[PDB]
Structure formats: C-alpha cells, structure tokens
Amino acid sequence: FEKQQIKKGRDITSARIMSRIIKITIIVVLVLLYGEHFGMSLSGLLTFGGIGGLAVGMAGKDILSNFFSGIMLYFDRPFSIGDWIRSPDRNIEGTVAEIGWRITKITTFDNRPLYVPNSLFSSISVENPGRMTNRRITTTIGLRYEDAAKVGVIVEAVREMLKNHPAIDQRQTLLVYFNQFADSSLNIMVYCFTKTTVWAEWLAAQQDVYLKIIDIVQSHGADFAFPSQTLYMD
Amino acid sequence: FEKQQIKKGRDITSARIMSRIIKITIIVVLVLLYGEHFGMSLSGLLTFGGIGGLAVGMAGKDILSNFFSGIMLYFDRPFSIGDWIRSPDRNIEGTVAEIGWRITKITTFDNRPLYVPNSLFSSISVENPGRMTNRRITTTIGLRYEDAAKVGVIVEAVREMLKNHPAIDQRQTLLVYFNQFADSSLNIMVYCFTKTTVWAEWLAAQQDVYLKIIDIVQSHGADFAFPSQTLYMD
Numbered sequence A, B: 001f002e003k004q005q006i007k008k009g010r011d012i013t014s015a016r017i018m019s020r021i022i023k024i025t026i027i028v029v030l031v032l033l034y035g036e037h038f039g040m041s042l043s044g045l046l047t048f049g050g051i052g053g054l055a056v057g058m059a060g061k062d063i064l065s066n067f068f069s070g071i072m073l074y075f076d077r078p079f080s081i082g083d084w085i086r087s088p089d090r091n092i093e094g095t096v097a098e099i100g101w102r103i104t105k106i107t108t109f110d111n112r113p114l115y116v117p118n119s120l121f122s123s124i125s126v127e128n129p130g131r132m133t134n135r136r137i138t139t140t141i142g143l144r145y146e147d148a149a150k151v152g153v154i155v156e157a158v159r160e161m162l163k164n165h166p167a168i169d170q171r172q173t174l175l176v177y178f179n180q181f182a183d184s185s186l187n188i189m190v191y192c193f194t195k196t197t198v199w200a201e202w203l204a205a206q207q208d209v210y211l212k213i214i215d216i217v218q219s220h221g222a223d224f225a226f227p228s229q230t231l232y233m234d
C-alpha cells in the first residue's frame, strides 16, 4: 500500500526497487529476532546483524548528523527566517527562506536557491548580519609622499566632518589616522559606523562621505596617488 | 504536555513531527529493556539497540563535542566577556558577548553577531589581545640605494627619537636596524611598543612617530623609495 501511495507521483522501476528494498529490510529484522525463536544458530545471526548495522551506521552518519542538527536548530535559534547569513568558512551567503529537518532552503542574492545540509551548522561558524545594528565604512586614502606636510590637518578635517555628519554613529568607533606607509603612497585609514543597517542608505552615506573627502583633499592642496615608479633609463 | 508547551511559540507541523520523534524514542528504550521481561529474543533486541545507539553516537559526536567544550570553558577560562579574541587558524575575530553550552555569541567589529560552536576552542589556538599589555609598532622605511651613506645616522636619529618619545615603552623591545636589501630599496625596520592598549592612542602615536620619521629622513637628505626599474631602450 505504501508502494501504491508512492506510485501516483513516481515510476514503476524505482517504486518496484524501493519495494524490494523495504521488503528485505523488514523481513531481515524479524528473521534476526525470531531466528532463535526458531532456534537456528543464534550467534551467527548476531554477527550478521552486527556487521550489517555497523556498516549501515558508518554510512548513515552523514544523514543523521543532518537530522540531529536540524533538531538543534529547531531548539537553538542561531538564526531565523529572513535573516541574512554568511560564514567566513564557506559560501552560504543568502537570506534564509525555509528551515527543514535535513536541510535549509536559502535564497542567495542571485535570487537562486541553495539547499544546505544542517550538519554543517554544527561544525562551522555562522554570522547573522541581519541581526546587526550598524554598518561599517572603511577606506584607505592614498596620498603621495609629497603631501606629507598636509596629513595632520587633512586628517583633522576629515574627522571633524564625520563627527558632524548626520548618518554617522558617534557612540561607536570613529578613527581617522595615518596608519601606514605604502609603496607609492601614504595611506590614511577611515573606519566609521553608520546608524543604519539598510543597504541603500549605507551606500548613499558612503557616497557623500567619499565625495566630501575628495573635496577636502583637493582643497588642502594634496591629491590622490596612483602607483609610481622611478625609471633609470639607459 | 511538552508538545503543548512547544505549541505556544511554534507550529503544528513541526511540533507534531517532534512529538512522533520523542514518542518513538521513549517507547523503543523501554521495549528494549523490558522486551526480555517479556522474554522476546533478547539478543536480537541487543543488536537492534547496539547498532541504533552506535549510529546515534557517530552522529551526535559533533554536538557532544560542543557541549563538553562548553563545560571546559565553564571551568577553564581562556577568555571571558568583553575580551577581544582572534585565532590565526580561523576567522573568529570579535568581542565576546555571551558564552553558552553549545555556542558563543561574538560581536565582530562589523557589529555583526557570530555564533561559534565550542568544539572549535578545543582544537584551535586562541589569542586574547584584550588581555594584552602593550601594542606594537612595525614599519619598513624604504630608502634608496643612493642614500646608503646616510643609513647609520638616520637609524641612530630614529632610535634616539623613539627613546625620547613619551608614548613608548622602553623596557620592552626597541629595534631600529638596517635589516635587508630589497628590490628598489634599502629597508630599515622599526619595531617598538606603546604602553597603551587603546586603539586610538596607539594610532595617534603611530601617526606622530611616522611623521617624525619623515621629517628626519627628508632632513638628512635622503628620501623614500618608490619601485624602480632600468629601461634598456631599443
């Protein structure tokens, strides 16, 4: 009757084979249990079942791990639905769309589905940026070695701008500091946080910040740096 | 009654399935134990339970490792809360926000949460810079081969500056030494320690140090080196 229920939406070949499989599986168990109720070589039957179930376990490890981790997700909620996810250790990055017992159905940002097994979440670090608070801005202003005299005041101006920018969160960090030399340039870091979590508003603020930086730089007399070389002709 | 407690904040589908699961799990155990109290094929039941629990263990390895490592963290305190962490072997880098029995909730420096399993801390080296004492400064002053005659005195001047800089810790190391040639440049190392652990003050001192280095170099007549080439035209 199970086979007939399987027959509506599947094939005869596979349903027949699956019938054979489940039939063998169900007869073998009761033969193993009542083979000594018949009284026929108990410990041989014991060995038979032992090695069979032993290989079966070594195989189905892969699947039961998925199932048990599905349970842990059912109770432990590292993420939920709609929560943008990623992992540094693997490509998972997408919005969750569905949880399952074996797997999860994520939608990437390609609008593609991704069917992930749940064993992975018990071995791997998971990042849920959808829960986050603020969004980061990071740059390196690459000036020239000619413009070294102008660095302190550029830096102070940039800082004073960010500190008086509406979109920016001043309770969080706010760092503008000449942090390294570099081949062909002097690199000023910028490290700031916007009080939005929205993609577009973050990007718009990033935009305004960058354009104001440009205006500041080119005002003070400096200019950005391309790569550079010294050619000793012959 | 457990199911009904689960029903308040979850669904009927999953709670029903979980009911089935726990029901099977609880009946099977007592059937296994009292199946011979009925007296029905003891050693067949023994095999059944053996292989079942064997696969179960091979699977739940992944989870029990997390739990036991959570216990070790409960007793052994490599880190605590508020302690910036990293590992060279993996991306974990963030401030701890919460410990758990299975996992930890870190906040990255993106203000993003990261849910890490605790099995990882028993396999991996962990660095707790939040406990540290002093912060390092490292650079390579890339001069030119033309400026080789000026290296000893530049070096000595730089050393004398750092040694008379307030923010610097002289009990720790302090190294300024011409350490390598390089394609296109002569590279002087700098390796020093600030007596702060704060990000911003460290960066400000880094700043002042670098600007003074620049002034020193350009005073003594040298200048920094871009990459370089010799072009043999034809």
Ligand SMILES: CCCCCCCC/C=C\CCCCCCCC(=O)OC[C@H](COP(=O)(O)OCCN)OC(=O)CCCCCCC/C=C/CCCCCCCC
Binding pocket: A056, A057, A059, A060, A061, A063, A064, A067, A100, A101, A102, A103, B017, B021, B055
């Ligand atoms: C480790 C050794 C074991 C190795 C693995 C051998 C295979 C084990 C048997 C297959 C696992 C169970 C598959 C899940 C479906 C259950 C079987 C089935 O026929 O249901 C089909 C059923 C569809 O329902 P209907 O078409 O309406 O049929 C109604 C039947 N009541 O399939 C489904 O997937 C239902 C939706 C669930 C999707 C989630 C992924 C599947 C897991 C479901 C629950 C957990 C079952 C597996 C773990 C059992 C642990 C005791």
Ligand SMILES: CCCCCCCC/C=C\CCCCCCCC(=O)OC[C@H](COP(=O)(O)OCCN)OC(=O)CCCCCCC/C=C/CCCCCCCC
Binding pocket: A068, A071, A072, A075, A076, B056, B057, B059, B060, B061, B063, B064, B067, B100, B101, B102, B103
């Ligand atoms: C290796 C084979 C085992 C494979 C794994 C099969 C699944 C095992 C069962 C699930 C593990 C236990 C989950 C932890 C919650 C306990 C079950 C539960 O219903 O509590 C929910 C409970 C929430 O509480 P209430 O909603 O108020 O309900 C009150 C119930 N007293 O869930 C919680 O997460 C509590 C907060 C703890 C968070 C820390 C992570 C979970 C671990 C908790 C403690 C350790 C339990 C697991 C190890 C047991 C070792 C004997």
